[PDB]
Amino acid sequence: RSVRHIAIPAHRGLITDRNGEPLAVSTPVTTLWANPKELMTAKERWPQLAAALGQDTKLFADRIEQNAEREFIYLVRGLTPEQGEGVIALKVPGVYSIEEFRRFYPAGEVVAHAVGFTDVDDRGREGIELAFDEWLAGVPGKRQVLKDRRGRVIKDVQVTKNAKPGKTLALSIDLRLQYLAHRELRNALLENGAKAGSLVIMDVKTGEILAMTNQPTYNPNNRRNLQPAAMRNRAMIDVFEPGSTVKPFSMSAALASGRWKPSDIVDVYPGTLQIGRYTIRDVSRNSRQLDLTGILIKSSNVGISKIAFDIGAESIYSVMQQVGLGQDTGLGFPGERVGNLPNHRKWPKAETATLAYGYGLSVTAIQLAHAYAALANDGKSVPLSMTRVDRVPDGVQVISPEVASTVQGMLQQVVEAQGGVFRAQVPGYHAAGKSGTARKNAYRSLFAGFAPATDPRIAMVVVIDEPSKAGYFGGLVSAPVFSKVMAGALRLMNVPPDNL
Numbered sequence: 001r002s003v004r005h006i007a008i009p010a011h012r013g014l015i016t017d018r019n020g021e022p023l024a025v026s027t028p029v030t031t032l033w034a035n036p037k038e039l040m041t042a043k044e045r046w047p048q049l050a051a052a053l054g055q056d057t058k059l060f061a062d063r064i065e066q067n068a069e070r071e072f073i074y075l076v077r078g079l080t081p082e083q084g085e086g087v088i089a090l091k092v093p094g095v096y097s098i099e100e101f102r103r104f105y106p107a108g109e110v111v112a113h114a115v116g117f118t119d120v121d122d123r124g125r126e127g128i129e130l131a132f133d134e135w136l137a138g139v140p141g142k143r144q145v146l147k148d149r150r151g152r153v154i155k156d157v158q159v160t161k162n163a164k165p166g167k168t169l170a171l172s173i174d175l176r177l178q179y180l181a182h183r184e185l186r187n188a189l190l191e192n193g194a195k196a197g198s199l200v201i202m203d204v205k206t207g208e209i210l211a212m213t214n215q216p217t218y219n220p221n222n223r224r225n226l227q228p229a230a231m232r233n234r235a236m237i238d239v240f241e242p243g244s245t246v247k248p249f250s251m252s253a254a255l256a257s258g259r260w261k262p263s264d265i266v267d268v269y270p271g272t273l274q275i276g277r278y279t280i281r282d283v284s285r286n287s288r289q290l291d292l293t294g295i296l297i298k299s300s301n302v303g304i305s306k307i308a309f310d311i312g313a314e315s316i317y318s319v320m321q322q323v324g325l326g327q328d329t330g331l332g333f334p335g336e337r338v339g340n341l342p343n344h345r346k347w348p349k350a351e352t353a354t355l356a357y358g359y360g361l362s363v364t365a366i367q368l369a370h371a372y373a374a375l376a377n378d379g380k381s382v383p384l385s386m387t388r389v390d391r392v393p394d395g396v397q398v399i400s401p402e403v404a405s406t407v408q409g410m411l412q413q414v415v416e417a418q419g420g421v422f423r424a425q426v427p428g429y430h431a432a433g434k435s436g437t438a439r440k441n442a443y444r445s446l447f448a449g450f451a452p453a454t455d456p457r458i459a460m461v462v463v464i465d466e467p468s469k470a471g472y473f474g475g476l477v478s479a480p481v482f483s484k485v486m487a488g489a490l491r492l493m494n495v496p497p498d499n500l
């Protein structure tokens with residue numbers, strides 16, 4: 001006779017979207033265990049027990065003999081109650097069932113990267129499951145038992161500690177927008193023969209992540225083998241050069257300096273600019289005088305570089321750091337990357353120019369979307385959240401409201417003006433944004449923007465990695481994805497059309 005204490009598993013808390021749609025649900029599973037000391041008295045039952053467990057008779061018999069000095073062995077973990085009851089129905093001495101919890105992900109591949117998953121022990125292993133593990137797990141209980149000399153449970157004496165169930169968690173994700181974003185990103189990858197992609201949707205007023213999808217994705221309900229590339233939450237754990245998508249932040253520094261107005265002109269002829277051994281190069285090289293809006297419409301690296309030389313890189317670095325590029329988001333997502341915003345005590349001319357046009361800095365899609373959200377929210381940055389926000393925290397004014405408003409207007413012209421990124425136009429609304437194309441010849445196609453331009457509600461980033469068709473420019477590849485997903489998101493959120 002021996003007094004022993006055994007655990008009582010806790011029910012893991014439900015994860016829902018922002019409207020209560022289930023995203024991660026704890027399902028009862030049966031764990032079958034056996035006491036090899038008791039099994040030894042019923043050898044004639046072993047072949048039927050092996051057959052029920054789908055094991056070769058001899059391998060099963062060998063396994064029980066090799067573990068003959070033990071009082072506990074796992075037979076099979078995570079069976080369905082129906083399957084466990086079938087083994088229990090054989091009435092084999094020394095065989096026991098135990099109720100365990102296993103996660104089911106009703107939206108499967110659609111929200112796999114954001115939700116993440118639990119391991120074999122029901123502990124958070126990836127995504128939100130890992131980030132909020134303490135909240136979701138609860139606390140296992142403890143049961144007191146009396147065991148005989150073979151280790152067989154003679155009596156259940158008392159519960160010493162009751163199990164405490166885990167707590168419900170409502171994400172910021174809107175499953176309707178998530179499904180729309182998932183489908184359009186998937187379609188774009190196919191249309192462009194692309195390797196990977198990410199799409200982030202943010203509420204500019206609340207800091208909430210309304211959608212976060214990546215390609216390739218995986219079914220978290222069937223994780224048998226399957227590629228590590230498919231499990232990466234790329235929006236948070238992959239870094240890239242943002243390129244021309246950071247030019248609005250360089251422009252914000254220009255307008256805040258007191259030295260530049262949108263109607264000021266920069267001469268970008270002949271479409272290149274030599275700075276020692278380095279040459280700044282424009283894509284289209286048939287311009288001379290461009291105004292500040294024109295520098296963004298034509299995406300002139302030369303133009304933004306000349307502005308950067310005039311105002312100094314310190315002013316540009318400060319805006320980019322303040323909007324969160326290459327900075328910790330504070331989300332604490334597992335494996336989340338910070339990227340890098342290079343710094344210098346004395347900025348050389350080449351580094352000043354490359355900073356201004358987003359070369360040599362590394363950011364995540366989440367960081368880029370957060371920066372555009374600050375710009376869209378009249379220069380005020382609301383802290384990021386992966387959970388439903390009921391009480392909105394105070395934001396930080398990172399760009400002056402007048403400067404943010406002027407840049408917003410310039411970005412609406414990037415989308416709407418003659419020669420602009422027309423594929424980003426959102427039917428029924430005024431939209432604003434900037435595309436980018438980064439050479440990694442392999443490319444990353446980008447679009448970052450927000451809408452409705454008259455009263456912004458949503459910021460969005462579209463990243464398409466290595467499009468393989470003739471078209472690779474961000475304005476061609478990523479801009480139409482932004483248009484479709486933004487139109488859908490605005491409609492789902494009942495945002496009144498502003499292009500009247």
Ligand SMILES: *C(=O)[C@@H](NC(=O)/C(=N\OC(C)(C)C(=O)O)c1csc(N)n1)[C@H](C)NC(=O)NS(=O)(=O)n1nc(C2=NC=C(O)C(=O)C2)n(CCCS(C)(=O)=O)c1=O
Nearest residue numbers: 243244284299359420421435436437438439473474475476
């Ligand atoms: C910004 O992202 C800029 N990128 C770079 O300078 C980098 N690479 O440039 C390329 C050209 C890809 C290269 O060196 O091969 C870069 C930055 S960080 C890094 N590692 N590399 C470029 C200049 N800007 C854009 O791509 N802007 S954009 O996506 O809006 N875009 N530009 C164009 C073209 N404009 C003019 C031309 O003559 C062209 O041939 C392309 N486009 C396509 C037209 C779009 S439309 C019909 O006007 O809407 C586009 O989308």
